[PDB]
Amino acid sequence: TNLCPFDEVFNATRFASVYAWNRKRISNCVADYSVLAPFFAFKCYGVSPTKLNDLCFTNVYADSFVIRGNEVSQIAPGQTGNIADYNYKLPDDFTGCVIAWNSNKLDSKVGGNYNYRYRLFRKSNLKPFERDISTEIYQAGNKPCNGVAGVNCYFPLQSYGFRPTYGVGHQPYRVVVLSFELLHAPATVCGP
């Protein structure tokens, strides 16, 4: 009866940029979701939070990233915006839970934290759970770029530059999306 490494995902030291969101696979353990106040965003879809302790699933996916405050609303089924379109897209029939909490004391630096970035330019929207780490120059005109940033040729990613003086809407928030996969194998993740 081993326990699920949720401390490795939530209490992790460094989170990834939303364009290169991290995915931790979880199988063969017992999870206490009831253990999971400082969490200021806890929205579950297709399942109630309590009953999760009485359920078993084939696999669990913990996707972790960091965005800005006013963008957390995009981490939900059937949403639009730069994050939901070009960075991290949840499916319309999403059965899981989105958890998010403010990390201003952890990810904001005086002078800017430019490590966290988000994809700004992309010709088409992402499919659900698609992951794009391409840093190729974006072609907005009728002429090619060939790795040369310039007129109608832009770098597709943009840094947040989190600062402690930003408003809570522009402050860094850490987001973990728990997806529950019911495959055709005996359930490995269970509750107490």
């Epitope: 730069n82 330019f121 005109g141 832009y154 003086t165 522009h170």
Partner: antibody, heavy 117, light 105 residues
């Protein structure tokens, strides 16, 4: 040559419809944030609508349910369809390419829309 | 939403003087998204400054943007007769009220 040529504006009665067109040159409408921004007579600039490169559309509160932004890649033209036109919609409407981080650099010449009975 | 307020409403100066236009935001906004545009009567807006401080292509060195947080400023060092127009600051969807620079007499 990178520019935007607008057309389609004129006189409309309140409650009527009108479709403004913005033919692009040098830039691809479908791979860019494209914005419609209006300016009322003697007033300032007001953002009207935007369409993302991926197709997501967003509208100002004063035009929701009445305005629809769209585009055509075969003709490389942005479009703004206005229905249920009101007296407050009389303005010069511009189309512009929004680079978000690099400002709205390419603008049109604007087209006038007058709505009165 | 964020509210950008420009000051002063009207700037009365003479050609050759220094113009300083302020744009104050209701909340602290990343300086990467703020732009300064110029508009003359009967013309379309013209992008002057992008990313708070970066000049667009074809803008004289007398125009320069600076500031951050909730206070940004566009300064025209050597005012020329063609520079007397209205100026808007814009952050994403929001636009500032505008500032008219007029001939001082």
């Amino acid at each position: 040559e990178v520019q935007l040529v607008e057309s389609g504006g004129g006189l409309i009665q309140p409650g009527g419809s009108l479709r403004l067109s913005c033919a692009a040159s040098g830039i691809t409408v479908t791979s860019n944030y494209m914005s419609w921004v209006r300016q009322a007579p003697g007033k300032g600039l007001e953002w009207v609508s935007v369409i993302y490169p991926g197709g997501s559309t967003f509208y100002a509160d004063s035009v929701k349910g009445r305005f629809t932004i769209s585009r055509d890649n075969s003709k490389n033209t942005l479009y703004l369809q206005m229905n249920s036109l009101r007296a407050e919609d009389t303005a010069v409407y511009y189309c512009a390419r929004d680079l978000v981080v690099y400002g709205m650099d390419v603008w049109g010449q604007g087209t006038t829309v007058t709505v009165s009975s | 939403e964020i509210v950008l307020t420009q000051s002063p409403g009207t700037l009365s100066l003479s050609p050759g003087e220094r113009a300083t236009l302020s744009c104050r935001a209701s909340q602290s906004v990343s300086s990467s998204y703020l732009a300064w545009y110029q508009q003359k009567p009967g013309q379309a807006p013209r992008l002057l400054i992008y990313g708070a401080s970066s000049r667009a292509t074809g803008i004289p060195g007398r125009f320069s943007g600076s500031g951050s947080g909730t206070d940004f400023t566009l300064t025209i060092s050597r005012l020329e007769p063609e520079d007397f127009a209205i100026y808007y600051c814009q952050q994403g969807v929001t636009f500032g009220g505008g500032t008219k620079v007029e001939i001082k007499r």
